Write a protein that binds this ligand. Structure first.
Ligand SMILES: [Mg+2]
Ligand SMILES: [Mg+2]
Ligand SMILES: [Mg+2]
Ligand SMILES: [Mg+2]
Ligand SMILES: [Mg+2]
Ligand SMILES: [Mg+2]
Ligand SMILES: [Mg+2]
Ligand SMILES: [Mg+2]
Ligand SMILES: [Mg+2]
Ligand SMILES: [Mg+2]
Ligand SMILES: [Mg+2]
Ligand SMILES: [Mg+2]
Ligand SMILES: [Mg+2]
Ligand SMILES: [Mg+2]
Ligand SMILES: [Mg+2]
Ligand SMILES: [Mg+2]
Ligand SMILES: [Mg+2]
Ligand SMILES: [Mg+2]
Ligand SMILES: [Mg+2]
Ligand SMILES: [Mg+2]
Ligand SMILES: [Mg+2]
Ligand SMILES: [Mg+2]
Ligand SMILES: [Mg+2]
Ligand SMILES: [Mg+2]
Ligand SMILES: [Mg+2]
Ligand SMILES: [Mg+2]
Ligand SMILES: [Mg+2]
Ligand SMILES: [Mg+2]
Ligand SMILES: [Mg+2]
Ligand SMILES: [Mg+2]
Ligand SMILES: [Mg+2]
Ligand SMILES: [Mg+2]
Ligand SMILES: [Mg+2]
Ligand SMILES: [Mg+2]
Ligand SMILES: [Mg+2]
Ligand SMILES: [Mg+2]
Ligand SMILES: [Mg+2]
Ligand SMILES: [Mg+2]
Ligand SMILES: [Mg+2]
Ligand SMILES: [Mg+2]
Ligand SMILES: [Mg+2]
Ligand SMILES: [Mg+2]
Ligand SMILES: [Mg+2]
Ligand SMILES: [Mg+2]
Ligand SMILES: [Mg+2]
Ligand SMILES: [Mg+2]
Ligand SMILES: [Mg+2]
Ligand SMILES: [Mg+2]
Ligand SMILES: [Mg+2]
Lengths: 99, 208, 71, 138, 83, 124
RNA sequence: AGCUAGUUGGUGGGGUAAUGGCCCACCAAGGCGACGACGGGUAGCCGGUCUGAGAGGAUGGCCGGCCACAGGGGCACUGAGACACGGGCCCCACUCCUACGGGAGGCAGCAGUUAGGAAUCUUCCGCAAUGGGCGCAAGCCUGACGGAGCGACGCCGCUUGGAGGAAGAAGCCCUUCGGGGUGUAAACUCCUGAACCCGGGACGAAACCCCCGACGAGGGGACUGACGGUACCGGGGUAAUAGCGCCGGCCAACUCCGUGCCAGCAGCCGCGGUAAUACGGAGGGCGCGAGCGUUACCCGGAUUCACUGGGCGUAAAGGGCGUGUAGGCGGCCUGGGGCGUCCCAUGUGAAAGACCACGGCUCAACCGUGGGGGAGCGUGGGAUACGCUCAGGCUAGACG
């Protein structure tokens, strides 16, 4: 099957593209305690149909760019910006820890 | 290869008869009946309480001495036994017994285990009608050990058979004295053997 | 093998280094840091500069002597 | 924060047994009740009633004890000699049916939360289902 | 051209083969597609060759090509035999 | 350390600090001597414990210890180090294995021979 | 600790077998980052191998898979497939010849040389096998492979005899002077015959090929062995290599003399400074044995990085305290979804290995056949306690 992922649209800032953010709650091989790691996926958005904070289902496609390999297959729930919010705050935080 | 040397010394050391002579060791000469102390310059000297390790080691030596095997071979056998299902201790001993030379000694074709080995290695021994000259050679159950036809007429073997004529083999074995055959019928056990060893100790030793 | 080789020459105690080591100037010449003998140490035999002491010296390195006898 | 319920309950039980309190008391829960049932049937307790302590649903847990024993250390031989949460929050523990713990080589038990319910290790093996391994008791 | 052929195994002076279907461009001992038979030339065993016939037939059908020795072996254990 | 802590940081895998830098993790290095000198041992041993500064095929310049009584070891002696810090002499981490190149068998040792490179004596 | 400007996304095009910033033109200004980007160091990666009870830790030699690279760096061309180890162009570095303009090279193919190194093989035979390429076939190649050589480099098997034989020869050693020890060990008698010699002699090789049969099935024929005159078999037939470590404790095994904190030993502790069971020898003993040791490395022991399985008053260890962001974590009841979780089914988990069983080498190592197991991941269905999530309610926590 084509790999199906579930994630929240953390960004729309490129034409016909969404930065989707997929959580993946996997148990940690050595210790066991189930980690909640997350990855950004850049996803082809044919229309700019999908706005920020949309939780979408994403499918691997032929390439349509260096680090953009996914059709947005379908929407699940929309508008849950809370989920975009945490991510955004994390991103912001970095600005601190430097020199 | 062999131990290849002074034997009743070994008997003296392990503090117990080990019968690596077969005839003399039976007689009033095993240097246990006449004398019985660990050899060399510190013989009659006080025997201080040995370590736990020490005892185990001595037991292993005893066992090894009895079956006349290069330590490596012994170790391999032990390992095999351990790998094998069934009680390692007993199974190990069974495996040891299974040795062709040892079987021959036990069947009686030769009086001494060394002698048996020698007999095997010259080609006087024949499993299942074939020259099986390998002292190592573990025999499976249901296998007929026989003196080779060309070795039946030879005097030593005849003498041994005569000695063994009437007097019993092992419970695990069968011997036909006339045709010089002898079937390794079942596989042996622990109670089936008179051994001065406590194979548990051997196991422990190997475990370390 | 244990080689009999050493030179049993005497010397003036020049200077006390640590441990019980001394730069002692011999009968013949060169000053070598010479450490005190074990025997001497055992019998507590002190040395100070301004002494004349027996100093056994090696063939391998005639630079490290050994102060043998109690002065 | 009271930050585990199940573990706390287990710990409460343990503490009450350590000083031979006839009956402990632990705030009620479905899961806790289930656990107690499993314990009860296995026999680590006399059983539980469910009282209302000061307004709130609470389970008395009637702790079983071995007989008053002769000699120095007159201390009634505990039946729950030791009790241990295994899947705690943080490190949660899920074991396949093959991986299900044989606690004390059979003697005491391991409580397993399964899709089939809370049930002893034995039960889990019988039904052939693993689950989240709650705790062991012996 | 996926061949049916004899992958050498065993040891020194202990030659053994597997009647094995592989792409021609391989280490003769290399990762083959299917082990469809085995064969001992030294004929030590009573079962000195055993080829699975159906699988071999299938391989032949897709156009696997048996190497001369392999072909011979197949013939011996009736794969080309038409009744 | 809480399991979350472990996940974050893990365990610092204990790196085995190498006791001998003869290099390559090689069993022996043959170096050429510079100075066969003699050294005073540490606090509780007193001798004139022999030694040789050795300059190596591994570029390092280390003082190996000479075992056995005597030595045809000189100055420009091509010699094989063995590795194995000797307790007494401070900062001497090696040996000279005897019975190779310039170093020769400790003469007329009858007992522990293979360790001193002394060829079996021809018994009459 | 920030990195990035073909960098990120778009449109358009080029290029490609094909997607694509792969590349370009033009916009838009992103994209990644402490869930550790970039930088540095290091390194082929894996099936496996070792080790470990296991979890794990190391490691990736050999055999199998994949990559990369064929002096260093570009680059294409040809082709089904390469940017091409024994094809091409170019630059560079090196060696090689040059009539000085110029060309010739490429062993990380086998073998060998030399260097470096502690250290690593024969300028071997063969196409008989199996595989490759070509060709109708014959056949030709084939340093793939098959074998032989050398190396105790490992593993396994075997030999250096066996039976008897003193109340104990000699020699050597201790002694308390009687004796003890070495030791049935030897000597010696009988036996058996590794070696060695003679006779025989493989299996591995039946196809390809030819004829009959249709050049099909199928049947018959004929040829062919590097190893190798080897293995092995039959006869013949002599008693026919033992060594190395250790002997204070850990650790199996002690006495004497030499020696005097010296010469030495040492893995740690530590022996030696005139009775050394620790040094050197001697006897004796213990361990292993065609080996035995040392070195180096790995794991183990080390629950000494502790997930299993440690700790933090005083031993190393609680931040000087707040307040907080990220994260981690989370009370009680009901309902759904079922992501985690569990189960079942099947797909995958190559081969070899490792596990088991049998089989073949006179045994074994080694190998073959057959079985099973398998962490993981895929898909279909299911389960709902837990965790998750969404919805609703509750008051024990929290705040008011
Ligand atoms: Mg051997
Ligand atoms: Mg020594
Ligand atoms: Mg395009
Ligand atoms: Mg790019
Ligand atoms: Mg541009
Ligand atoms: Mg680098
Ligand atoms: Mg590298
Ligand atoms: Mg690695
Ligand atoms: Mg490989
Ligand atoms: Mg080169
Ligand atoms: Mg080039
Ligand atoms: Mg290049
Ligand atoms: Mg090419
Ligand atoms: Mg090229
Ligand atoms: Mg390439
Ligand atoms: Mg080349
Ligand atoms: Mg080469
Ligand atoms: Mg050379
Ligand atoms: Mg060199
Ligand atoms: Mg070779
Ligand atoms: Mg040729
Ligand atoms: Mg061919
Ligand atoms: Mg022609
Ligand atoms: Mg040619
Ligand atoms: Mg070869
Ligand atoms: Mg060999
Ligand atoms: Mg060697
Ligand atoms: Mg004898
Ligand atoms: Mg004879
Ligand atoms: Mg011949
Ligand atoms: Mg002799
Ligand atoms: Mg001892
Ligand atoms: Mg010692
Ligand atoms: Mg001594
Ligand atoms: Mg070795
Ligand atoms: Mg550990
Ligand atoms: Mg812990
Ligand atoms: Mg601690
Ligand atoms: Mg402190
Ligand atoms: Mg504080
Ligand atoms: Mg706070
Ligand atoms: Mg928070
Ligand atoms: Mg909850
Ligand atoms: Mg939460
Ligand atoms: Mg497999
Ligand atoms: Mg297999
Ligand atoms: Mg067999
Ligand atoms: Mg709620
Ligand atoms: Mg208040």
């Amino acid at each position: 099957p084509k790999k199906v992922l579930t994630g929240v649209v953390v960004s729309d800032k490129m034409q016909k593209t969404v930065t989707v953010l997929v959580e993946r709650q996997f148990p940690h091989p050595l210790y066991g305690k189930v980690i909640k790691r997350s990855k950004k996926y850049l996803a082809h958005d044919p229309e700019e149909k999908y706005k920020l904070g949309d939780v979408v289902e994403i499918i691997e496609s032929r390439p349509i760019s260096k680090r953009k390999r996914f059709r947005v297959l379908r929407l699940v729930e929309s508008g849950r910006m809370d989920l975009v919010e945490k991510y955004l705050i994390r991103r912001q935080n970095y600005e601190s820890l430097s020199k | 290869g062999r131990y290849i040397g002074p034997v009743c010394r070994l008997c003296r050391r392990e503090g117990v008869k080990l019968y690596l002579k077969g005839e003399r060791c039976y007689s009033p000469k095993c240097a246990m009946e006449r004398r019985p102390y660990p050899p060399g310059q510190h013989g009659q000297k006080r025997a201080r309480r040995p370590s736990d390790y020490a005892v185990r080691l001595r037991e292993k030596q005893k066992l090894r001495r009895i079956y006349g095997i290069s330590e490596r071979q012994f170790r391999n056998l032990f390992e095999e036994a351990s790998k094998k299902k069934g009680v390692t201790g007993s199974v190990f001993l069974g495996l040891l017994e299974s040795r062709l030379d040892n079987v021959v000694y036990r069947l009686g074709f030769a009086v001494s285990r060394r002698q048996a080995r020698q007999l095997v290695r010259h080609g006087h021994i024949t499993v299942n009608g074939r020259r099986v000259d390998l002292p190592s050679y573990r025999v499976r159950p249901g296998d007929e050990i026989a003196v080779a036809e060309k070795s039946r007429n030879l005097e030593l073997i005849r003498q041994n058979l005569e000695a063994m004529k009437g007097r019993k083999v092992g419970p695990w074995l069968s011997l036909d004295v006339e045709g010089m055959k002898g079937k390794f019928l079942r596989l042996p056990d622990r109670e089936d053997l008179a051994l001065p060893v406590n194979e548990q100790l051997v196991i422990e030793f190997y475990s370390r | 093998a244990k080689e009999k080789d050493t030179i049993r020459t005497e010397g003036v105690v020049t200077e006390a280094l640590p441990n019980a080591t001394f730069r002692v100037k011999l009968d013949s010449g060169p000053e070598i840091l010479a450490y005190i003998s074990g025997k001497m140490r055992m019998h507590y035999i002190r040395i100070l500069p301004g002494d004349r002491v027996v100093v056994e010296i090696t063939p391998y390195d005639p630079t490290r002597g050994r102060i043998v006898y109690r002065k | 924060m009271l930050t585990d319920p199940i573990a706390d309950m287990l710990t409460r039980i343990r503490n009450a047994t350590r000083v031979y309190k006839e009956s402990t008391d632990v705030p009620a829960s479905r899961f806790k009740e289930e656990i107690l049932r499993i314990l009860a049937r296995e026999g680590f307790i006399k059983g539980y009633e469910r009282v209302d302590v000061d307004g709130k649903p609470y389970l008395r847990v009637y702790l079983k004890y071995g007989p008053r024993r002769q000699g120095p250390d007159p201390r009634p031989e505990q039946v729950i000699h030791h009790i241990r949460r295994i899947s705690k929050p943080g490190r949660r523990v899920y074991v396949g049916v093959k991986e299900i713990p044989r606690v004390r080589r059979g003697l005491g038990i391991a409580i397993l939360s399964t899709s089939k319910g809370v049930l002893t290790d034995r039960e889990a093996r019988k039904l052939g289902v693993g689950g989240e391994l709650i705790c062991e008791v012996w | 051209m996926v061949k049916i052929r004899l992958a050498r195994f065993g040891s020194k002076h202990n030659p053994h083969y597997r009647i094995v279907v592989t792409d021609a461009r391989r280490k003769r001992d290399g990762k083959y597609i299917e082990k469809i038979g085995y064969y001992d030339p030294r004929k030590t065993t009573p079962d000195w060759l055993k080829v699975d016939v159906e699988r071999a037939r299938y391989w032949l059908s897709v156009g696997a090509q048996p190497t001369d020795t392999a072909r011979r072996l197949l013939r011996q254990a009736g794969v080309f035999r038409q009744e | 350390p809480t399991i979350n802590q472990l996940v974050r940081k893990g365990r610092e895998k204990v790196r085995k600090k190498s006791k001998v830098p003869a290099l390559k993790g090689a069993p022996f290095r043959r170096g050429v001597c510079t100075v066969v000198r003699t050294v005073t041992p540490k606090k509780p041993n007193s001798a004139l414990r022999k030694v040789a500064k050795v300059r190596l095929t591994s570029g390092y310049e280390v003082t190996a210890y000479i075992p056995g009584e005597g030595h045809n070891l000189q100055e420009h002696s091509v010699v094989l180090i063995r590795g194995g810090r000797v307790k007494d002499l401070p900062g001497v981490r090696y040996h000279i294995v005897r019975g190779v190149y310039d170093a020769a068998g400790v003469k007329d040792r009858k007992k522990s021979r293979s360790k001193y490179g002394t060829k079996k004596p021809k018994e009459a």
